[PDB]
Amino acid sequence: SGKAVDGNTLVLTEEFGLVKIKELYEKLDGKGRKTVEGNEEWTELETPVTVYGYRNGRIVGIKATHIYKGISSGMIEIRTRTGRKIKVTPIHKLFTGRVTKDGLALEEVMAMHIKPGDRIAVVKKIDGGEYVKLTTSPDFRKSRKIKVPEVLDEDLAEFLGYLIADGTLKPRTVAIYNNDESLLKRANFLSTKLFGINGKIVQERTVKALLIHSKPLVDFFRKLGIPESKKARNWKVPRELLLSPPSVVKAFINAYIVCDGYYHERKGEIEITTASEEGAYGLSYLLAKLGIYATFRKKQIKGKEYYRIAISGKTNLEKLGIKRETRGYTNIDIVPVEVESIYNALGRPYSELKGEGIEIHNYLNGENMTYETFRKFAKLVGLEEVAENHLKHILFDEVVEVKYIPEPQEVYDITTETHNFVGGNMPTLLHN
């Protein structure tokens, strides 16, 4: 076949949020002239959609002008240390990187040639965001019994964080469960501010609850895609949150973590365990809007499968305003850097590097340099811009396993001006 990805590959879009590329195809098929050539077809979209791509060291919105479907006789599945699992055609390209005296160069590598130990470009920061106006019917929308927020701001985002992490929706009641009565009071304050109605705090057998009795309010959250309970296995992050400014995402994430995130001392990581796999993948994209690289793992808990998102390591935690040493954390943000050639090209700044705690010899025999060490090194060798832009956005993630899968299937791709777009179960740079 051609260059393309498995239909379950997520893609971040402005118009539809984070969606499987096969779902995107089903939405867009027919909405433009299609050219068919045997096992390949291309649609030129009547209305281009917006995805995200990498350009000039940043990750910003870019137009996708075409969508492709092909039929492939086999696939390659790539797993990485962070928990990305990408399934693509053998000639589909990923990117490896090298930092030299001249900056960061991304190199295209076909999936058929990827091997364990390679490090592929993934996204740890997604730029952009605007305050999203909540979409209305052009019909006969608008409850008049409550006040309906019209912009997704930090207050609503905080409330959504409590509701998704620790809430239930019954047909006529919104509930938030927590043993901190001050958090329940805060949620009630927000409900008055946002919706003009409030609830009451009920002391229950093993937990307190804030109960807000309003069918219009339930309907508002259901239209947003809020799960009916913690255990919903199919809930998704709302598109409007993925398009929001980082301040809004931060309000949501902080609220989620206070409700159902847990800090593990020995490992140096905040863990979120959710029952929704696509909800977990969506959390990873939200975290990239904060500049955080999540890890992902499937876990067994009392005979059922759960999805663990970890915010791990001192650098990630700083992005939440948390200042903590994590000496038990294994570094996974490793920069491929040609240390010796850079050092010589810059005239061997031995004393200056020693002053930053770097002994150049410790990197001359293939040793890994962390991003944190590279930030310091870079300032002394003329590479600050690469450290503070390109490598603020791109992490080079270790491939742990590659497998050829000899099963034919339909595959999909999109066309962008950058020849790349952001997709995968956690944000990954995909070539087109």
From TrEMBL:
Protein name: A-type ATP synthase subunit A
Subunit structure: Has multiple subunits with at least A(3), B(3), C, D, E, F, H, I and proteolipid K(x).
Localization per record: Cell membrane
Protein's organism: Thermococcus litoralis (strain ATCC 51850 / DSM 5473 / JCM 8560 / NS-C)
Function per UniProt: Component of the A-type ATP synthase that produces ATP from ADP in the presence of a proton gradient across the membrane. The A chain is the catalytic subunit.
Location of this fragment in the whole protein: 235 to 666 of 1014
Domain called DOD-type homing endonuclease: residue spans: 159-292
Source organism phylogeny: Archaea, Methanobacteriati, Methanobacteriota, Thermococci, Thermococcales
Family: Belongs to the ATPase alpha/beta chains family.
